[PDB]
């Protein structure tokens, strides 16, 4: 609280109006609401290094984004200030923000929103000096060989069981190693690297404009990370989120039918992505394949996160992991099926 107020004071924002403040989500402590000067702010705090590589990457995005026209499908809320030493950032609040996760649950992330998202990400990938060129720790390759003991003491029995299934699947582990190895063999681009539906916000209770937020992992990196993540989110929505005992074959049949009904969403995103990055496949013909491989890992990623509140892995979880494995070990076919071709 002190470090936040100190920054609000110095920016001319007064203080956080405790009567109208409210905590928002994510692995960081965040505050949103009116300040005593009446301005609406979003405040994020990140635990410094014993400064803060996640805010330096987030700011590196804000620097690129300030030099952008107001017609860009890619928009920042607007950075108001930052204290990277103390782990504090402040942005303009988007009024009546609905996250992409809420929209997808409600049924509102439609084909046309998916296209705008593709345009935003395609725009991102076009835009590179002063970008972190370090590799994103996803997939987590050291964890696939051995979870650090401190990580095991903070996980659920189901997350541990899910880790173990991945660790003992030699084909999956080898594929994830190949996937990260390929990143130094492709034309890199400015990439979010942590893209999910909850990193998107839309203004006016869902009727406003589209923002992509949480740039803590922003890097010069494989564009397939962001395309794959977007496809993987739909994959995971379709084969898990909507289902949350049948037979395994019935779970698979329902999941397959559910995915097919959601494939247009991925198609729209890729349409939009090509509108704004028309030269993508000309530079990287392997991009569809690599994207599909990231979509596969993304399901494991989302299944392991979801398990934090469970003690066993349910049969839907296991069925979804099976689809994740199929997309990862067969990336050329999953790309075509997902609609990421030509």
């Amino acid at each position: 609280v002190p470090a936040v107020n100190a920054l609000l004071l110095r920016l001319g924002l007064g203080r956080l109006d405790a009567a109208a403040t409210t905590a928002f989500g994510g692995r960081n402590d965040n505050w949103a609401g009116p300040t005593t000067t009446g301005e609406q702010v979003f405040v994020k705090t990140v635990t410094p290094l014993p400064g803060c590589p996640e805010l330096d990457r987030s700011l590196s995005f804000e620097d690129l984004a300030a030099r952008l026209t107001p017609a860009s499908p890619l928009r920042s809320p607007g950075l108001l200030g930052a204290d990277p030493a103390a782990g504090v950032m402040v942005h303009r609040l988007v009024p009546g923000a609905r996250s992409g996760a809420e929209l997808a649950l409600d049924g509102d992330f439609d084909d046309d929103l998916c296209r705008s998202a593709g345009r935003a990400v395609g725009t991102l990938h076009g835009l590179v000096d002063g970008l972190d060129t370090g590799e994103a720790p996803l997939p987590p390759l050291s964890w696939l060989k051995a979870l650090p003991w401190s990580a095991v003491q903070e996980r659920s029995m189901a997350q541990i069981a899910a880790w173990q299934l991945v660790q003992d699947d030699t084909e999956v582990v080898d594929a994830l190693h190949r996937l990260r190895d390929l990143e130094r063999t492709v034309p890199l681009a400015p990439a979010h690297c942590d893209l999910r539906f909850d990193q998107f916000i839309r203004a006016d209770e869902g009727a406003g404009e589209l923002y992509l937020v949480d740039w803590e992992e922003f890097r010069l990196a494989d564009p397939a990370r962001d395309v794959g993540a977007f496809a993987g989110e739909w994959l995971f929505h379709a084969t898990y989120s909507v289902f949350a005992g049948l037979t395994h074959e019935e779970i698979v049949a329902r999941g397959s039918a559910s995915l097919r009904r959601h494939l247009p969403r991925i198609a729209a995103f890729w349409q939009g992505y090509l509108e704004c990055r028309p030269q993508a496949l000309a530079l990287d013909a392997g991009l569809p394949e690599r994207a599909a491989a990231y979509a596969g890992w993304h399901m494991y990623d989302r299944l392991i996160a979801t398990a934090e509140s469970h003690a066993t892995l349910n049969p839907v979880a296991r069925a979804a992991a099976g689809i994740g494995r199929t997309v990862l070990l067969g990336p050329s076919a999953a790309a075509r099926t997902l609609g990421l071709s030509a």
Partner: protein, 313 residues
């Protein structure tokens, strides 16, 4: 005109309960103690009725954890270390501190080498090692603070005697927690245990759960002696119909032992309720020979219908 009279072959506690339960002909409607339940299939009534039975008969009904409660539960634990065996995959050598990659039974993990306890020196990859791992595990069981006992559990694991304590609220839980852990250690028991770490979900009959392995009698006697003091003040007096009462709010059973491939990862309470729901449904799908349907379903699930807290040999 006795519940035992109309329900022969069934433990009386269970026979009494089935008088609060009816399933309509065709198994599209059921009623558990005024808690009516409906479905469009027999097959979907199985899952809903299972749930109603579980709530009414096992649990007794009808988000986050708490760092204060956790801190007090953590303090109550009498030990801090549980030796754990696994196979050494690889010694990692760092100047900042050497590390062991160890395949534990549940996961491959990267452990500081200062935890090795046997052999006295990191062996060749493939050799069993033994490590001093934290006894407390506050994230392992969502909703709960979990502790492993100081003494390692048997290798075949074996049958696990469960003991449930009906803590009335968080304060009783701390006391019952401490008494039970103190008791189980002193008795040299092979166990895990856990207690609700969410103060807004008491009372529960399973607010504390103890999992006793090897020979449970010493640890059960010890725990019963240690908590009977509090039993009815700190514990609500009601227990699950599927369990053997040992005292007001102190109940016991065995982990399900269903020799049917599909049945696994089911709690005692969910398993008993599912067997009961099945038998009740199979009954409704004909046309008391009702108790026979129930008795058949329990036996097929491996439950002793005379003592459903137990399994068949």
């Amino acid at each position: 005109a006795s519940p035992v009279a109309r329900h022969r072959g069934l433990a009386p506690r269970l026979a009494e309960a089935l008088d609060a339960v009816s399933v309509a002909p065709g198994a599209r409607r059921a009623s558990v103690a005024g808690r009516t339940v409906t479905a469009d299939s027999p097959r979907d009534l199985r899952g809903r009725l299972t749930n109603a039975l579980y709530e009414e008969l096992h649990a007794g009904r009808h988000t986050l954890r708490d760092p204060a409660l956790e801190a007090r539960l953590a303090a109550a634990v009498p030990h801090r270390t549980t030796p754990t065996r696994g196979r050494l995959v690889e010694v990692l050598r760092r100047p900042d501190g050497d590390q062991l990659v160890v395949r534990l039974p549940e996961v491959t993990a990267r452990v500081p080498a200062d935890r090795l306890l046997s052999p006295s020196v990191p062996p060749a990859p493939g050799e069993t090692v033994e490590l001093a791992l934290e006894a407390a595990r506050p994230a392992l069981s969502p909703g709960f603070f979990y502790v492993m006992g100081s003494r390692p559990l048997p290798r075949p694991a074996g049958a696990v005697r469960r003991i449930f304590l009906h803590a009335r609220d968080a304060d009783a839980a701390v006391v019952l927690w401490g008494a039970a852990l103190g008791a189980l250690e002193e008795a040299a028991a092979l166990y895990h245990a856990k207690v609700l770490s969410d103060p807004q979900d008491f009372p529960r009959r399973d607010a504390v759960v103890l999992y006793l392995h090897g020979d449970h009698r010493p640890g059960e006697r010890a725990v019963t002696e240690a908590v009977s003091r509090y039993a009815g003040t700190l514990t609500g007096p009601d227990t699950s119909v599927f369990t053997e009462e040992l005292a007001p709010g102190v109940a016991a059973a065995w982990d399900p032992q269903d020799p049917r491939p599909g049945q696994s990862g089911m709690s005692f309470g969910q398993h008993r309720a599912f067997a009961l729901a099945s038998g009740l449904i199979d009954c409704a799908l004909a046309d008391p020979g009702r108790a026979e349907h129930v008795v058949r379903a329990l036996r097929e699930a491996g439950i002793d219908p005379l003592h459903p807290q137990n399994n068949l040999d």
